[PDB]
Structure 1
Amino acid sequence: YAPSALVLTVGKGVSATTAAPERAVTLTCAPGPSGTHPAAGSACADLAAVGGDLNALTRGEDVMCPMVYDPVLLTVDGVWQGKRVSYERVFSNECEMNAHGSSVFAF
């Protein structure tokens, strides 16, 4: 039984709050992949891959983003395989945020 529950938020800014959270989803990989993720199944899959390790989620290689500087803060909170997680990362703009997971940030 996987204790697995995450909450992802995104807002414009460079720190947790000085960055109002404009969007927020929840992801559950255990038992089955569910939640509020226009891409539950996949994110879980992405995590499965790297094994819950934010920081080991390769960008694109295949995608270009506009070179606008409009930073986005992403926060991840919860547990993966019953190990607590609290990740936070600022991306240059949102396109950069989306070229990161495959699906996790497929939001």
Structure 2
Amino acid sequence: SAHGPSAMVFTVIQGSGEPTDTVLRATTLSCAYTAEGTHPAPRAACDALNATDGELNRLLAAPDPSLVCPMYFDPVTVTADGVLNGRRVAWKHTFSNTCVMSANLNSNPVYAF
């Protein structure tokens, strides 16, 4: 329920999230009096980030219940690092494959980059 300014880096990585793994996409986001960063939709992204109430696992609280995904393995990892509500944070989540990622995140504005 704590409120503070945020300055974050979000990334999507091809694989388990190993050091040599390819960074498919990344973007920056800053929320204070203004919503800015390299994020294509900062206003929407900052609002979506604040909805988690500090728990970034809540970026996965609303999955696509109808999207039927294959049960194969082609791992994809999402990350979030920086300042979240005035406190330094580090979070990552690896999905079985890209479908599983699409379905779980369900077009959350934070990862809409």
TM-score range, shorter chain: 0.7 to 0.9
2:112 aligns with: 106
Note closer, same or farther for the CA distance 1:41–1:25 as it changes in structure 2 (3 Å cut). Answer: same
| CA radius of gyration, larger in | 2
2:97 aligns with: 93
Compute the TM-score of the two structures, normalised by the length of structure 1. Answer: 0.81
1:63 deviates by 4.8
Note closer, same or farther for the CA distance 1:62–1:13 as it changes in structure 2 (3 Å cut). Answer: same
Residue 22 of structure 1 aligns to a residue whose secondary structure is: strand
Note closer, same or farther for the CA distance 1:52–1:4 as it changes in structure 2 (3 Å cut). Answer: same
Compute the TM-score of the two structures, normalised by the length of structure 2. Answer: 0.77
Query: Of residues 38, 45, 48 in structure 1, which corresponds to 2:47?
Result: 45
1:36 aligns with: 38
Query: Where do 4+ consecutive residues of structure 1 move more than 6 Å?
Result: none
1:54 deviates by 0.5
2:87 aligns with: 83
Query: Which protein has the bigger helix share?
Result: 2
1:8 aligns with: 10
Is contact 1:78–1:84 with CA below 8 Å preserved after alignment?
yes
Note closer, same or farther for the CA distance 1:94–1:37 as it changes in structure 2 (3 Å cut). Answer: farther
Structure 1: runs of 5 or more not aligned: none
Paired letter, 1:105: Y
Structure 2: runs of 5 or more not aligned: none
Aligned length: 107
Paired letter, 1:106: A
User: Considering only aligned residues, what root-mean-square deviation do their CA atoms show, in Å?
Assistant: 2.3
